[PDB]
Amino acid sequence: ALLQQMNLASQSLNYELSFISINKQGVESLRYRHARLDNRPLAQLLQMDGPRREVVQRGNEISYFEPGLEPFTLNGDYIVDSLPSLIYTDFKRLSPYYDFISVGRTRIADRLCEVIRVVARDGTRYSYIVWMDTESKLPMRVDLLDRDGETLEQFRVIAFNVAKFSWTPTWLPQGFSEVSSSRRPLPTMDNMPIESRLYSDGLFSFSVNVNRATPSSTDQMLRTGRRTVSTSVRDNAEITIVGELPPQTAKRIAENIKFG
Amino acid sequence: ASGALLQQMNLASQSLNYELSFISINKQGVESLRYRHARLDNRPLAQLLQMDGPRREVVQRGNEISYFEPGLEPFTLNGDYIVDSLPSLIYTDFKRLSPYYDFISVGRTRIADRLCEVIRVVARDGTRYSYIVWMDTESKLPMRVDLLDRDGETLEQFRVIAFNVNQDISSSMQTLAKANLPPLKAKFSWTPTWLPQGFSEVSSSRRPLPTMDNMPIESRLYSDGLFSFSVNVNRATPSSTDQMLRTGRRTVSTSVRDNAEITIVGELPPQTAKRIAENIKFGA
Numbered sequence A: 001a002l003l004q005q006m007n008l009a010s011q012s013l014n015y016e017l018s019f020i021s022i023n024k025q026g027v028e029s030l031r032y033r034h035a036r037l038d039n040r041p042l043a044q045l046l047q048m049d050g051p052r053r054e055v056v057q058r059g060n061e062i063s064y065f066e067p068g069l070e071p072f073t074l075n076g077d078y079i080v081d082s083l084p085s086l087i088y089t090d091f092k093r094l095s096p097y098y099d100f101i102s103v104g105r106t107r108i109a110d111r112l113c114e115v116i117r118v119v120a121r122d123g124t125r126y127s128y129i130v131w132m133d134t135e136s137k138l139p140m141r142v143d144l145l146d147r148d149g150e151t152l153e154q155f156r157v158i159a160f161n162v163a164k165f166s167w168t169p170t171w172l173p174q175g176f177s178e179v180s181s182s183r184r185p186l187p188t189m190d191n192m193p194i195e196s197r198l199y200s201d202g203l204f205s206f207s208v209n210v211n212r213a214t215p216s217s218t219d220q221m222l223r224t225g226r227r228t229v230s231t232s233v234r235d236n237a238e239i240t241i242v243g244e245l246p247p248q249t250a251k252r253i254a255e256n257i258k259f260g
Numbered sequence B: 001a002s003g004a005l006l007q008q009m010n011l012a013s014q015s016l017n018y019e020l021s022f023i024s025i026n027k028q029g030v031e032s033l034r035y036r037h038a039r040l041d042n043r044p045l046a047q048l049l050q051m052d053g054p055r056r057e058v059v060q061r062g063n064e065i066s067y068f069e070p071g072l073e074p075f076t077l078n079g080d081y082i083v084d085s086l087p088s089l090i091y092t093d094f095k096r097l098s099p100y101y102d103f104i105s106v107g108r109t110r111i112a113d114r115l116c117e118v119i120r121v122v123a124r125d126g127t128r129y130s131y132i133v134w135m136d137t138e139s140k141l142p143m144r145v146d147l148l149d150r151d152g153e154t155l156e157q158f159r160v161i162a163f164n165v166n167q168d169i170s171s172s173m174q175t176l177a178k179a180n181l182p183p184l185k186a187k188f189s190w191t192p193t194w195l196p197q198g199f200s201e202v203s204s205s206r207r208p209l210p211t212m213d214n215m216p217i218e219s220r221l222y223s224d225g226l227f228s229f230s231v232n233v234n235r236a237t238p239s240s241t242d243q244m245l246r247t248g249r250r251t252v253s254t255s256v257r258d259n260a261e262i263t264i265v266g267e268l269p270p271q272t273a274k275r276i277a278e279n280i281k282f283g284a
């Protein structure tokens, strides 16, 4: 129980990582750089194979660039899928309904690391097994694992260096806070409105989306890596859960969302 | 001419006062519904009532569509008509389709003890679903409509069971004709290089997905006047993969290329959707 260091070291330190990302659709070669001048962070993610796609951070100004396209910027707090989002976790408020297991130390990229496991108390969310570096405290490898124990997504380092709805979910994994809500129109001929409620437990996030049921709305269950799209049809509504949640759970959140 | 009948069906559904008790059939099951319609002051009046289970009701008064249901707050939205009530085919400007579709008469038959003109609506390029229409010879109102996939299998059926055309406006349409009715550009870096003949861009919109990083997704709604589908493009995620799911008139095609997750949603044969996706260019 001391990832907080890895957390601070990743944000408050200068470095470079020539890591790879492995999932069910390939293994890609990347690279991430960090820094912090006047307390403002600096990042940079690059694709070493094929198109020189790039992404950079600056305070809250992430910008995208790549061959043959017009650049642009978005407002964010840190580049996602550039480094395990486990990095920015606010553990002090997470620990209450969480628990961190110590699990020996090993070698990740010719370095001595300290393996640590993260888990939800109730066992509703996914799981993480991180390999922190002894020296720097910078993560060398983080694995997302499903309840079973398989790796949904692997972050491996290769070289170090320095508004108002009519519905309400009556059941949440204890730890998630309704980060927001919104009601935008679907891109249909009838501008069908869909209401959304974004959640998060400090680590994982998922959305609950609702639209009037239609004659083609059917219960579906699709999971790819850390993306789980669960649809359920009942009470004249089409409920879609999207996020880092095992099916069993998503399906449960959509079954306790009562209307009045 | 067939095209003229389809044209007539269109007007009768908008001008006459009538009540249709019908069913909606698909994989999901059979739905019992009643549709009441009336024209008052050159203004649409209608109610769609789910006859079974909870009393769900929808109503049209001009360009307002109010949704009533027990145990929930009534509300209103804008709309030119109630979706999934009468077959949307009825509101089609067939003149616009004539150069792309064949309106083939298939003869006559009975439906709900009434004589009907049987017409087949088919897109000549073979890229789309087709329809079959059973029209009530006397009133021109639709008695049955079948959405068929390219192989001829029924994806959805509308069928009238009980029918009535009224010279006067019923008491319920009147009660509706004035009541406590509840309150209520973009430019993308991509372009679908290939589209079946007849489809045109109806709208476009960039909005943030309900994620933690407010990931942007761009949408383009297309229509040829009868069928519709949208092309949505968001930043490719490491969790993005090719998929194809069809359920009735809804096809959800997802492709992944050039760092973009492409999702086609709408009334299209899986093959047309894939082709549209595979032909989207970026810049240059």
Ligand SMILES: CCCCCCCCO[C@@H]1O[C@H](CO)[C@@H](O)[C@H](O)[C@H]1O
Pocket (backbone or CB within 6 Å): A186, A187, A188, A190, A192, A214, A215, A216, A217, B083, B084, B232, B248, B249, B250, B263, B265
């Ligand atoms: C980016 C994701 C967009 C999803 C848009 C879903 C739009 C569903 O739209 C609905 O589809 C039904 C068939 O499924 C039709 O029967 C309904 O009439 C139509 O309004």
